[PDB]
């Protein structure tokens, strides 16, 4: 056959299109899975992954750290308003909460 070029490189993506397609078929969702559905799923997951990691990297530089540790991921999710509403019902382990103090609480 021809060269086994990955579908992620064909779509300009890093997330695995085939793994998403395989998990969609074995995940018991529909009788058939379309061709562009894993490509759309990979783009959405990668953009969500890249957005949080960039914000986590921004939070990592705020506390001068070169390694992403779970406090950075929790800080990135809660600081962003859209990530807060998307993950409102989501508990992040080893992350704590935002360090905010009530206005009337200060002396």
């Amino acid at each position: 056959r021809a060269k086994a070029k990955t579908r992620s490189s064909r779509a300009g993506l890093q997330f695995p299109v085939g793994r998403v397609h395989r998990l969609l078929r074995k995940g018991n969702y529909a009788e058939r899975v379309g061709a562009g559905a894993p490509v759309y799923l990979a783009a959405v997951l990668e953009y969500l992954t890249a957005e949080i990691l960039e914000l986590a990297g921004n939070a990592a530089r705020d506390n001068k750290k070169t390694r992403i540790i779970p406090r950075h991921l929790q800080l990135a999710v809660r600081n962003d308003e859209e990530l807060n509403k998307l993950l409102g019902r989501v508990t992040i382990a080893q992350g704590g909460v935002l360090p905010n103090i009530q206005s009337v609480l200060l002396p």
Binding site: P70, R89, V90, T91, I92, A93, V97, Q102, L105
Partner: protein
Amino acid sequence: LRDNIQGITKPAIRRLARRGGVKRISGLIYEETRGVLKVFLENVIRDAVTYTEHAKRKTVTAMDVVYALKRQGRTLYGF
């Protein structure tokens, strides 16, 4: 195993409220917080018990705890 509801000590409940930004903690909060935690634990562990019973397993795994928390809108990341 008896009187294990007192394992969540008063400074531990004090420390938990400090993470939540609580200024002052009443003396009756610790008894109420223990009861709330006991009720919350009695739902998650019981749900995890059914998850463990369904798998023909005798030890509750971390994945079953995640599914027990996920079905009630309290999904947990990292396990």
